[PDB]
Design an enzyme around this catalytic site. Sequence first.
Site, PDB file in Angstrom:
ATOM      1  N   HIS A  97      -9.354   1.264   7.643  1.00 30.16           N
ATOM      2  CA  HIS A  97      -7.872   1.799   7.645  1.00 30.16           C
ATOM      3  C   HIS A  97      -7.551   3.082   6.778  1.00 30.16           C
ATOM      4  O   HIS A  97      -6.438   3.604   6.695  1.00 30.16           O
ATOM      5  CB  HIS A  97      -6.779   0.599   7.897  1.00 30.16           C
TER       6      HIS A  97
ATOM      7  N   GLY B 210      -2.316   0.804  -2.283  1.00 28.64           N
ATOM      8  CA  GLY B 210      -3.265   1.321  -3.061  1.00 28.64           C
ATOM      9  C   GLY B 210      -4.389   0.047  -3.324  1.00 28.64           C
ATOM     10  O   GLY B 210      -5.556   0.471  -3.858  1.00 28.64           O
TER      11      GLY B 210
ATOM     12  N   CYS C   6      -5.715  -2.107  -1.499  1.00 31.86           N
ATOM     13  CA  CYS C   6      -6.691  -2.267  -0.244  1.00 31.86           C
ATOM     14  C   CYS C   6      -8.154  -2.072  -0.604  1.00 31.86           C
ATOM     15  O   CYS C   6      -8.156  -1.032  -1.299  1.00 31.86           O
ATOM     16  CB  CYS C   6      -6.286  -1.690   1.197  1.00 31.86           C
TER      17      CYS C   6
END
EC number: 3.4.19.12
Lengths: 304, 304
Positions: free
Chosen positions: B41, B143, B145
């Site tokens: 993603h 942020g 992830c």
Amino acid sequence: SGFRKMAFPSGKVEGCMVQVTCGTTTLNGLWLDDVVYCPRHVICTSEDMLNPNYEDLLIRKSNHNFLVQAGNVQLRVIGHSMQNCVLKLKVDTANPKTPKYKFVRIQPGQTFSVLACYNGSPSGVYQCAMRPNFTIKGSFLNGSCGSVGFNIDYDCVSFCYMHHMELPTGVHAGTDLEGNFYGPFVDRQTAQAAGTDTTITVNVLAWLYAAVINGDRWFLNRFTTTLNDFNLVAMKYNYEPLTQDHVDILGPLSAQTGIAVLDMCASLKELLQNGMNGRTILGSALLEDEFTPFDVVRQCSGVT
Amino acid sequence: SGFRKMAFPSGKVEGCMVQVTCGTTTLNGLWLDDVVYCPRHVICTSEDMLNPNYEDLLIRKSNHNFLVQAGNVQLRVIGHSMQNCVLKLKVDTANPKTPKYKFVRIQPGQTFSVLACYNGSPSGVYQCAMRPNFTIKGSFLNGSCGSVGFNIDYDCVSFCYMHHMELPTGVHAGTDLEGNFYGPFVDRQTAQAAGTDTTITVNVLAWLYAAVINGDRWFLNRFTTTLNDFNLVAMKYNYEPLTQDHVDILGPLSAQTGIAVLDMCASLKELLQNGMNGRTILGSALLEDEFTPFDVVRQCSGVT
Ligand SMILES: NC(=O)c1ccc(NC(=O)[C@@H]2CCCO2)cc1
Ligand SMILES: NC(=O)c1ccc(NC(=O)[C@@H]2CCCO2)cc1
């Protein structure tokens, strides 16, 4: 979102941990520049610990009696001195992995990360608080002495704690990196009882702010209080008195959430008086006091 | 003595964390050998996340569109592939700090350390469990992830989790390092509701063993139970059924403490039925289920 009891990343401190052996006693040392810091009780037998004369025991010790091993490599000890309750072992090699660092003596209520070590090898990292009775509630087995507590400001490790002893009640006592015990504790195996383990009120309020920020809000009420009224309740519940200093410290969290500090105080007062009624806040059934306002801001904003 | 929610020392994983940027999306990558792993993603706008076609979005991406920075140094991306929900970015440089490592897909109830990162920079480390509903209760801001979950066996980091998404209920979902989500979760911004967050019974029992070992024993009672009887109570309280496998796993703690597993079950049954009555166990007012039997043994014996 979510709120976790979070330690600092331990890598910078892992790179400082060494094994110190004197005779049959092995514990951990902290290697910064060309100095290894360790509890002076490394020179004691279990017998010695009952009534140690450190100056006298230390006379019977030479540089070559302090065995310092960093990983699988021996360090050469070219000097040793006692500073309060720590030994400083001068070694011929500057720790190449020495981070930017400070020695800081923290206040009660301040939080720090412990890197639990055995034989100079890290076993784990956890967050704890200097308790108002100057103990910490750690996790320390035999060999864990010389494990250190620290904070990190970006790239600077502030070392605030070195582990020295477990009280008969299984709470922990240690020193700053100048070898000065937190509170009245001594590196002797004696009757040392901790004082009242009061709750760090400012840290509870911070954590209540963290709870609201993260969606846990059932405990917000219709009431406010004053510092004096709140403090009557605090006293009753062995909570540290809240000062205007603490209110000022909570100002940013107050601002972010739009909940006045004294309103959060009134919510905390109702939680003290009424209990949680089987409900939880950030997955805790008791009021968590090992997050500082700074910890809540740091974790809620994502400082690295 | 003392028992703490303890993460693994994070140093080995700190050395693997990089920043990955694709367009305007920045998140974290894991750099092992000459591969950087990150959530796929990273290629999505916030708009894309509503209904992403990853194969189609990825077509519009070239090696030079993936900006990989390790500290202040840019890595050259010489290849990129999608494996399930992760991207593997081949870089021209093997991570010199690549530890011994494995990718492991953990079972529900298994614990691991998370190194929370922002812009490839570690912010903190905490311990958590794969919940029985295949969520984790983490601490993850925008942020975060590509932050990873791991266990360490001496010098081998077993990577078990990469952070991908927060459910609307503020619990967390992610993948193993093969990009396969834990549970039914998808990397799409949709209605994804977690199932019943049941309590990891075997972990509660382990933690009750840890409590006895560390002197917290008020909850030991005069009773025993059977697996079937206990499980009737477990079901009632949304506790995972206890199996003979779990009993066998608790055998060492049973042995150490001399408390039969089924007796500890009978103590846990009384705690479920009677509550804690305002008392605490290892400083918790609720039954802690994020220690595995292995975690209790490790922490109670001091494995490094
Ligand atoms: N009875 C004592 O000898 C004693 C020594 C030191 C302290 N204070 C502290 O340990 C920290 C250090 C910053 C202030 O609070 C308290 C009592
Ligand atoms: N509904 C699903 O697609 C689904 C996918 C995977 C799992 N199992 C796990 O995530 C872990 C992995 C080891 C076994 O348990 C469960 C459900």
